[PDB]
């Protein structure tokens, strides 16, 4: 379920750069591109800030992701969580490490169900988000 959300976002992002790979989705495609725009405004595509290697990616991913929610969670920070993962999958493919994509998605899925699931429920769940973001599309 939350893993499907991860799948469709990864698939979506990967498509967005011409790479194939085998409602909450639409809203989330929207917020991420929204984020995308804002991010590329002040900084350069984050692919440049990513230094990746097969056996260093999981830790890197973890480190960053924890620095994100280290002090709190808000939907903005979660769309960011999404953008981050997807950018890692696109970088992966581009750096000739396509296999990782499948791993990155698992990492995300786990992180979602393990460390964010509580905030989500406590804060209205996914429909809450689909309703907050509603007026931004």
């Amino acid at each position: 379920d939350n893993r499907e959300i991860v799948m469709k976002y990864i698939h979506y992002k990967l498509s967005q750069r011409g790479y194939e790979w085998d409602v909450v989705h639409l809203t989330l495609r929207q917020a991420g591109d929204d984020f995308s725009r804002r991010y590329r405004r002040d900084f350069a595509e984050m692919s440049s800030q990513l230094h990746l290697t097969p056996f260093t990616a999981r830790g890197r991913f973890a480190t960053v992701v924890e620095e994100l929610f280290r002090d709190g969670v808000n939907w903005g920070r979660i769309v960011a969580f999404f953008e981050f993962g997807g950018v890692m999958c696109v970088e992966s493919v581009n750096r000739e490490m396509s296999p990782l994509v499948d791993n990155i998605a698992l990492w995300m899925t786990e992180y979602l169900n393990r460390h964010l699931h509580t905030w989500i429920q406590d804060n209205g769940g996914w429909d809450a988000f689909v309703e907050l973001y509603g007026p931004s599309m």
């Binding site: 917020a31 984020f35 804002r38 002040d42 984050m46 800030q49 620095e67 808000n74 007026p135």
Partner: peptide, 26 residues
């Protein structure tokens, strides 16, 4: 700069922007 700080700033800016786009839509 730090990738995580970049993510937070934008992450927050986006939260603020939709809470506002939400206030408006009321």
């Amino acid at each position: 700069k730090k990738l995580s700080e970049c993510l937070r700033r934008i992450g927050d800016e986006l939260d603020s922007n939709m809470e506002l786009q939400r206030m408006i839509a009321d």
